Design a protein around this ligand. Structure first.
Ligand SMILES: *[C@@H]1O[C@H](CO)[C@@H](O[C@@H]2O[C@H](CO)[C@@H](O[C@@H]3O[C@H](CO[C@H]4O[C@H](CO)[C@@H](O)[C@H](O)[C@@H]4O)[C@@H](O)[C@H](O[C@H]4O[C@H](CO)[C@@H](O)[C@H](O)[C@@H]4O)[C@@H]3O)[C@H](O)[C@H]2NC(C)=O)[C@H](O)[C@H]1NC(C)=O
Ligand SMILES: *[C@@H]1O[C@H](CO)[C@@H](O[C@@H]2O[C@H](CO)[C@@H](O[C@@H]3O[C@H](CO[C@H]4O[C@H](CO)[C@@H](O)[C@H](O)[C@@H]4O)[C@@H](O)[C@H](O[C@H]4O[C@H](CO)[C@@H](O)[C@H](O)[C@@H]4O)[C@@H]3O)[C@H](O)[C@H]2NC(C)=O)[C@H](O)[C@H]1NC(C)=O
Ligand SMILES: *[C@@H]1O[C@H](CO)[C@@H](O[C@@H]2O[C@H](CO)[C@@H](O[C@@H]3O[C@H](CO[C@H]4O[C@H](CO)[C@@H](O)[C@H](O)[C@@H]4O)[C@@H](O)[C@H](O[C@H]4O[C@H](CO)[C@@H](O)[C@H](O)[C@@H]4O)[C@@H]3O)[C@H](O)[C@H]2NC(C)=O)[C@H](O)[C@H]1NC(C)=O
Ligand SMILES: *[C@@H]1O[C@H](CO)[C@@H](O[C@@H]2O[C@H](CO)[C@@H](O[C@@H]3O[C@H](CO[C@H]4O[C@H](CO)[C@@H](O)[C@H](O)[C@@H]4O)[C@@H](O)[C@H](O[C@H]4O[C@H](CO)[C@@H](O)[C@H](O)[C@@H]4O)[C@@H]3O)[C@H](O)[C@H]2NC(C)=O)[C@H](O)[C@H]1NC(C)=O
Ligand SMILES: *[C@@H]1O[C@H](CO)[C@@H](O[C@@H]2O[C@H](CO)[C@@H](O[C@@H]3O[C@H](CO)[C@@H](O)[C@H](O)[C@@H]3O)[C@H](O)[C@H]2NC(C)=O)[C@H](O)[C@H]1NC(C)=O
Ligand SMILES: *[C@@H]1O[C@H](CO)[C@@H](O[C@@H]2O[C@H](CO)[C@@H](O[C@@H]3O[C@H](CO)[C@@H](O)[C@H](O)[C@@H]3O)[C@H](O)[C@H]2NC(C)=O)[C@H](O)[C@H]1NC(C)=O
Ligand SMILES: *[C@@H]1O[C@H](CO)[C@@H](O[C@@H]2O[C@H](CO)[C@@H](O[C@@H]3O[C@H](CO)[C@@H](O)[C@H](O)[C@@H]3O)[C@H](O)[C@H]2NC(C)=O)[C@H](O)[C@H]1NC(C)=O
Ligand SMILES: *[C@@H]1O[C@H](CO)[C@@H](O[C@@H]2O[C@H](CO)[C@@H](O)[C@H](O)[C@H]2NC(C)=O)[C@H](O)[C@H]1NC(C)=O
Ligand SMILES: *[C@@H]1O[C@H](CO)[C@@H](O[C@@H]2O[C@H](CO)[C@@H](O)[C@H](O)[C@H]2NC(C)=O)[C@H](O)[C@H]1NC(C)=O
Ligand SMILES: *[C@@H]1O[C@H](CO)[C@@H](O[C@@H]2O[C@H](CO)[C@@H](O)[C@H](O)[C@H]2NC(C)=O)[C@H](O)[C@H]1NC(C)=O
Ligand SMILES: *[C@@H]1O[C@H](CO)[C@@H](O)[C@H](O)[C@H]1NC(C)=O
Ligand SMILES: *[C@@H]1O[C@H](CO)[C@@H](O)[C@H](O)[C@H]1NC(C)=O
Ligand SMILES: *[C@@H]1O[C@H](CO)[C@@H](O)[C@H](O)[C@H]1NC(C)=O
Ligand SMILES: *[C@@H]1O[C@H](CO)[C@@H](O)[C@H](O)[C@H]1NC(C)=O
Lengths: 284, 512, 199, 50
């Protein structure tokens, strides 16, 4: 009341909530490691046509290995901050590794137009993913030019994003050009190894989790829980809901997750928020 | 209704009929039809215009309505009918006097209070989140004034119920002998068979309202419903006390202590209050009691058959739920952020740029909560304006006999009986209606000996040969004497005066 | 596409405006449609010397409104509001810039009322005919016919004045009533600011 | 900004609708009690005895 004197009556003061007791971390128990070492440490990168589309699944992704490597040019991420990538879990991670001159590295971006950016592959505007670059002059640049790599300069139609349309016919001039990577060129004319990671944040049972360790299950008590990156506080009870085998989550009217499937055992847990209410003070 | 048929007419509003037939709706079958009609509201396609007089079924506008009729069933459009044409046979010396009456008990339904709600700001806006609760403190004191407004509405609802129902000071009760002058009151007096001592009509009114999982789903969002102060048994006890006082004491329990009186004499004084002499009831008491019992049975059959008359209370049930289900369903909105779940924004973004996304969600949910509080305040003002009228009708018609025209039922008011209902009150208005008209020839005054004779109360009428004086609201001819007439002036002033002999009762007493 | 993410604001604003639009027609029906049958006056217009020719409907008018109703409709400069202006030359650039065409282009329209003025005038005509030829009897039950002088004497008897006063001063009472009706007509014709509550 | 601009208009229309409904209820009461019958309430329908 912002007063030192309280009159006779009933006054609503605050709200009580049952505080959680334990914190639960829950994750699938895969132990395999990513093919990241088969991507960044590749002996010879591909061009924009072969495009090196690599699927990553059933892995315990440790992005801090990229943090322990000093030689990295850019680590620019959309949708997910790079420092929290170990605290999330992803369904399938797609890696695209290629070599492009340093002038056109900035061209490859969603909503950015260019020659390589439009004529080879676009990036969609809903791209939740990261791009990593490195100036690798030691291996990609060769004496008297590196003529193995071949890139587009002219294409009649702007391609739909993530397409592999390859054509070598003469357009209406031969539209393909070898960039002739030399070690004596300027900074803008140096080859760059660029790897683009695209992840799907869906409701599917995810496989590419972080290095977090799962704990035991606590039922019928107000606890903090973490199911594959889904954080919350509530009571996990046994549910009689008949989940279809393709379904993972269950949602309420207000688009809130109220039923979950455990990523280790195949049981279904109902999440109910802990007991709360208002507090009224009855005084003379 | 989809229960009846599936035919559909389409009204293009404000569009000339030569301009409606690309198009944004994919369907086009109801834009190039063969039943195109032009109204002032727009172009109506799919309904055939018939030029007959019907009352309005589905209102279109500008005097045009629509309905579904066997014209073979189809949707027709017409001009709405105001009513049956009548012509009063006015004349210089013609009057119409009712020779019979009827007793009509009608039903009036009034909302009194609505649902008292409480909203937790922190659980609705953030929901088990610490950093959102820390960020919410920078927005000032909006939650305190929202809680203050909801507390004011919640106090005002109990004030409305206390003002309407608690107008009696002592809880009266009827004697176990239930002979109230031949009138049957068993369908409104309380029944001890039910665990909650309500009447038959009160039980029907409680069953005809579908008053309320949705409640458990909105309970988890910080949206709670407070119980009312007065339970339904207490409201039933108030209505029982008012009914017992009105039956066994008349209007005298409103002015002070209850004064007992037989119901026949009380109801005869109710007739005397509306300009009908009290011998009419003492000559037609059996007929009046039978008509009252028949009207009570008709109300029972109407309430058991059709439940669509209680919609004025049902909206009070509806608007207090439909406004809540919207408030839950606005937690799924993103408001330009990346997600409608705050924990994903916390676990996917760092603290530099997550707060920018979280601020849009906080502002959108705060705006939605303020919108809900504003509509609740407007609806509370409307409910209070209805409850004041309900309290006035209880004070002036249950506790007395109103002379205001059409305030309590059509006709001359005699009685009213209150019944409780979910979030409201129901008045059974017992009124007097004249029934069987008859034509008579009238005159303002009568020349007896060169002096005008005006009636004291009643109307001078003629049956063709003789002249009598009657009451205004009932036909009862009597001999025109000097007792019921008074003398003023001579015969040369009044327009329409007639010649008749005024009897003198003193002259046969001199012949003894 | 960006507005689709903001939720159900548009639905509840449309619901509120639809509720207001229904409530206006309910108000008009509650006020004017109190009579059951459309009564009409007899063709002879003698009512004990009282003159009702200025409030009874005029058959010469196409809208079937009375003289005082014509003055009341002339004093209020009601806009067309766009339900009259349904024509497609509002789209074309004609005349000058119009506020109704601009707010029609902005998405703000006006719906017509359910009851036209030719029906409100018929309700007021029926109420006037019932009040004149039957008194208070048409409010309760059937319309009981009564001479107007006897009805007015009973109106005097309702306020504590005996009924011989009217039968001795009927000509003076009728002349005072006609003079007062003419004074209302002159006051409404001279001054155009009397209806500001509607304006 | 435009959504707030529309909500303010809707709220003011609701308040004016409530005021107009109060005036319409008063007009209905005046039609029922004064046109359809004689009134004994002082200064309800005109100054003087109605
Ligand atoms: C003013 O208006 C009221 C109604 O608004 C009239 O009351 C009715 O009057 C009629 C005629 O007198 C009654 O009809 C007759 O009733 C007789 C028995 O009445 C009892 O039973 C009825 C149910 O049937 C109860 O409702 C009632 O209260 C009584 O307890 C019957 O025996 C009569 O039948 C005869 O006529 C019929 C044709 O109608 C024949 O087929 C039969 O074979 C038989 O010969 C008849 O039905 C009526 O009951 C009254 N109603 C009520 C509720 O009492 C007033 O009469 C009227 N007053 C004036 C002065 O006009
Ligand atoms: C209800 O009852 C009243 C009164 O009873 C009727 O009103 C009139 O009543 C009188 C008699 O009661 C009728 O007779 C006429 O009286 C007139 C007035 O008399 C004065 O004037 C004469 C001179 O004319 C004096 O001698 C006398 O002393 C009075 O001072 C007379 O003027 C009439 O004269 C008739 O005859 C002469 C010829 O002698 C003609 O020149 C006249 O024109 C006239 O025709 C006559 O004597 C009188 O007729 C009644 N009035 C009417 C309008 O009829 C009411 O009529 C009655 N109501 C009904 C419905 O009948
Ligand atoms: C009940 O009250 C009504 C209204 O007062 C009486 O009816 C007559 O009403 C008219 C006007 O409505 C009175 O005025 C006369 O109007 C004539 C018509 O012209 C007007 O009306 C037309 C439409 O009909 C308009 O288009 C036009 O512009 C005019 O406004 C005029 O021709 C008359 O003029 C004559 O009289 C004047 C008097 O000063 C002379 O100077 C002229 O030279 C000319 O001869 C007149 O102005 C009319 O007076 C009313 N009649 C009477 C008898 O008063 C009802 O009669 C009344 N009923 C009862 C029972 O009291
Ligand atoms: C209660 O108060 C009323 C006033 O509201 C008195 O009634 C009469 O009122 C009128 C004014 O409205 C007075 O004058 C009228 O003048 C008109 C023109 O006549 C001229 O010529 C005569 C004769 O020379 C003069 O007396 C007059 O002053 C004018 O110069 C006439 O047309 C009027 O007639 C109207 O009134 C009579 C009733 O008086 C009706 O029957 C007629 O049909 C017509 O409508 C009138 O002459 C007049 O002076 C007032 N009357 C008197 C007697 O003074 C009431 O009289 C008053 N009552 C009491 C008890 O005081
Ligand atoms: C590609 O090859 C390089 C070179 O081998 C890999 O870099 C090295 O990866 C290891 C992870 O196994 C890093 O971790 C550890 O560092 C500590 C301290 O330096 C050391 O004591 C451990 O024995 C271990 O090496 C290591 O820092 C990192 N760098 C170097 C210079 O050794 C890289 O992981 C490979 N894969 C990719 C995708 O780049
Ligand atoms: C009281 O008397 C009046 C005056 O007669 C009645 O009004 C009228 O009654 C007649 C009689 O049936 C109704 O029919 C009409 O008859 C005339 C003449 O025969 C005829 O030309 C018409 O075509 C019509 O058939 C008439 O409709 C009715 N009303 C009017 C306005 O004239 C009245 O009915 C009587 N009331 C009672 C209760 O008896
Ligand atoms: C006042 O009205 C009530 C009903 O509105 C009357 O109560 C009814 O009285 C009858 C005979 O006394 C009861 O008996 C029979 O019930 C069977 C069904 O069990 C029915 O099919 C028969 O037609 C007959 O009605 C009836 O149960 C009873 N109803 C109730 C609800 O209690 C009461 O008698 C009336 N009072 C007076 C003084 O007339
Ligand atoms: C690792 O996960 C696997 C499955 O992903 C577990 O193996 C079985 O999981 C099903 C799932 O309901 C259980 O019903 C079986 O009882 C599990 N088998 C055994 C032998 O336990 C496996 O248990 C998990 N291991 C750990 C250490 O959590
Ligand atoms: C639709 O209206 C009908 C009455 O017109 C309701 O009742 C049904 O009537 C039919 C016709 O004889 C019966 O065969 C059914 O058994 C009745 N009941 C039902 C449940 O269909 C009917 O309830 C209405 N339906 C809806 C959804 O309102
Ligand atoms: C709205 O529709 C009506 C009815 O078709 C149009 O009225 C016609 O207009 C033309 C030219 O103005 C006339 O030759 C016709 O005689 C009119 N028909 C009738 C029945 O009056 C009206 O013009 C249309 N509105 C617009 C703006 O074009
Ligand atoms: C892909 O799409 C383009 C245009 O959208 C079309 O011309 C082409 O034939 C399609 N297929 C391949 C293999 O490029
Ligand atoms: C009424 O409608 C019918 C058919 O639609 C038509 O023949 C008749 O002329 C119409 N009458 C009037 C008065 O409009
Ligand atoms: C009028 O009533 C009287 C008294 O009841 C009676 O003598 C006379 O015959 C009646 N006249 C008619 C025409 O019915
Ligand atoms: C009487 O009635 C006739 C016709 O209904 C009417 O013309 C006349 O004005 C009335 N009054 C008198 C006094 O004749």
């Amino acid at each position: 009341l912002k007063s030192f004197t309280v009159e006779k009556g009933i006054y609503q003061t605050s709200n009580f909530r049952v505080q959680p007791t334990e914190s639960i971390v829950r994750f699938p128990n895969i132990t395999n490691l990513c093919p990241f070492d088969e991507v960044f440490n590749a002996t010879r990168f591909a061009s924009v046509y072969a495009w090196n589309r690599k699927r990553i699944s059933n892995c315990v992704a440790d992005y801090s290995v990229l943090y322990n490597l000093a030689p990295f040019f850019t680590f620019k991420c959309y949708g997910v901050s790079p420092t929290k990538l170990n605290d999330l879990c992803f369904t399938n991670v797609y890696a695209d590794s290629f070599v492009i001159r340093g002038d056109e590295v900035r061209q490859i971006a969603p909503g950015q137009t260019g020659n390589i950016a439009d004529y080879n592959y676009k990036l969609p505007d809903d791209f939740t993913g990261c791009v990593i670059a490195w100036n690798s002059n030691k291996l990609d640049s060769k004496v008297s030019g590196n003529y193995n790599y071949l890139y587009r300069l002219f294409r009649k139609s702007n391609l739909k994003p993530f397409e592999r349309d390859i054509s070598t016919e003469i357009y209406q001039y031969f539209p393909l050009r070898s960039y002739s990577f030399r070690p004596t060129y300027g900074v803008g004319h140096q080859p760059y190894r660029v790897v683009v990671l695209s992840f799907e944040l869906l409701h599917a049972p995810a496989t590419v989790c972080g290095p977090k360790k799962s704990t035991n299950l606590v039922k019928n008590k107000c606890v903090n829980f973490n199911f594959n990156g889904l954080k919350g506080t509530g009571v996990l009870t046994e549910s009689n809901k008949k989940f279809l085998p393709f379904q993972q989550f269950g949602r309420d009217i207000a688009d809130t997750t109220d039923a979950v499937r455990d990523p280790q055992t195949l049981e279904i847990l109902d999440i109910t928020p802990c007991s709360f209410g208002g507090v009224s003070v009855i005084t003379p | 209704g989809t229960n009846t048929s599936n035919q559909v007419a389409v009204l293009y509003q404000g569009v000339n009929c030569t301009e409606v037939p690309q198009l944004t709706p994919t369907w086009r079958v109801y834009s190039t039809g063969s039943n195109v009609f032009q109204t002032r509201a727009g172009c109506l396609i799919g309904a055939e215009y018939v030029n007959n007089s019907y009352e309005c079924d589905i209102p279109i506008g500008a005097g045009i309505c629509a309905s579904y009729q066997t014209q073979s069933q189809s949707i027709i459009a017409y001009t709405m009918s105001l009513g049956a044409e009548n012509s009063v046979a006015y004349s210089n010396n013609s009057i119409a006097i009712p020779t019979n009456f009827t007793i009509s008990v009608t039903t009036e339904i009034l909302p009194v209070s609505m649902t008292k709600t409480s909203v937790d700001c922190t659980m609705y806006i953030c929901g088990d989140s610490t950093e959102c609760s820390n960020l919410l403190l920078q927005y000032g004191s909006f939650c305190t004034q929202l809680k203050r407004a909801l507390t004011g509405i919640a106090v005002e609802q109990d004030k409305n119920t206390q003002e309407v129902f608690a107008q009696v000071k002592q809880i009266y009760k009827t004697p176990p002998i239930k002979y109230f002058g031949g009138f049957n009151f068993s369908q409104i007096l309380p029944d001890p068979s039910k665990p909650s001592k309500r009447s038959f009509i009160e039980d029907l009114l409680f069953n005809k309202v579908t008053l309320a999982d949705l409640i458990c789903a909105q309970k988890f969002k910080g949206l709670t419903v407070l119980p009312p102060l007065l339970t339904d048994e207490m409201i039933a006890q108030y209505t029982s006390a008012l009914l017992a006082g009105t039956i066994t004491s008349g209007w005298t329990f409103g002015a002070g202590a209850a004064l007992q009186i037989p119901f026949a004499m009380q109801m005869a004084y109710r007739f005397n209050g509306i300009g009908v002499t009290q011998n009419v009831l003492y000559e037609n008491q059996k007929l009046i009691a039978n008509q009252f019992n028949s009207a009570i049975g008709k109300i029972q059959d109407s309430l058991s058959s059709t439940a669509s008359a209680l919609g004025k209370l049902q909206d009070v049930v509806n608007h207090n739920a439909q406004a809540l289900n919207t408030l839950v369903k606005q937690l799924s909105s993103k408001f330009g952020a990346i997600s409608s779940v705050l924990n994903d924004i916390f676990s996917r973004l760092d603290k530099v740029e997550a707060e920018v996304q979280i601020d849009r969600l906080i502002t959108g949910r705060l705006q939605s909560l303020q919108t809900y509080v504003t509509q609740q305040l407007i609806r509370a003002a409307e409910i209070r304006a209805s409850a004041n009228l309900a309290a006035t009708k209880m004070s002036e018609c249950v506790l007395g006999q109103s002379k205001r025209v059409d305030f309590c039922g059509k006709g001359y008011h005699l009685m009213s009986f209150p019944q409780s209902a979910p979030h409201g009150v129901v008045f059974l208005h017992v009124t007097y209606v004249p029934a069987q008209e008859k034509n008579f020839t009238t005159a303002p005054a009568i020349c007896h000996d060169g002096k005008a004779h005006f009636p004291r109360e009643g109307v001078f009428v003629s049956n063709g040969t003789h002249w009598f004086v009657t009451q205004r609201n009932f036909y009862e001819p009597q001999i025109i004497t000097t007792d019921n007439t008074f003398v003023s002036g001579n015969c040369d002033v009044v327009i329409g005066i007639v010649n008749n002999t005024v009897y003198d009762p003193l002259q046969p007493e001199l012949d003894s | 596409n960006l507005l689709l993410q903001y939720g159900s604001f548009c639905t509840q604003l449309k619901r509120a405006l639809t509720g207001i639009a229904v409530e206006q027609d309910k108000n008009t029906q509650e006020v004017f449609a109190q009579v059951k049958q459309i009564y009409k006056t007899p063709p002879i217009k003698y009512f004990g010397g009282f003159n009702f020719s200025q409030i009874l409907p005029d058959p010469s008018k196409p809208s079937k409104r009375s003289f005082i109703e014509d003055l009341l409709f002339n004093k209020v400069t009601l806009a067309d509001a766009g339900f009259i202006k349904q024509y497609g030359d509002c789209l074309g650039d004609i005349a000058a810039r119009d506020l109704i065409c601009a707010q029609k282009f902005k998405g703000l329209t006006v719906l017509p009322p359910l009851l036209t003025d030719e029906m409100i005038a018929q309700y007021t005509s029926a109420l006037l005919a019932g009040t004149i030829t039957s008194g208070w009897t048409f409010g309760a039950g059937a319309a009981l016919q009564i001479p107007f002088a006897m009805q007015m004497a009973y109106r005097f008897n309702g306020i504590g004045v005996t009924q011989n006063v009217l039968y001795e001063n009927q000509k003076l009472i009728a002349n005072q009533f006609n003079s007062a009706i003419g004074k209302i007509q002159d006051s409404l014709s001279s001054t155009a600011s009397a209806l500001g509550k509607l304006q």
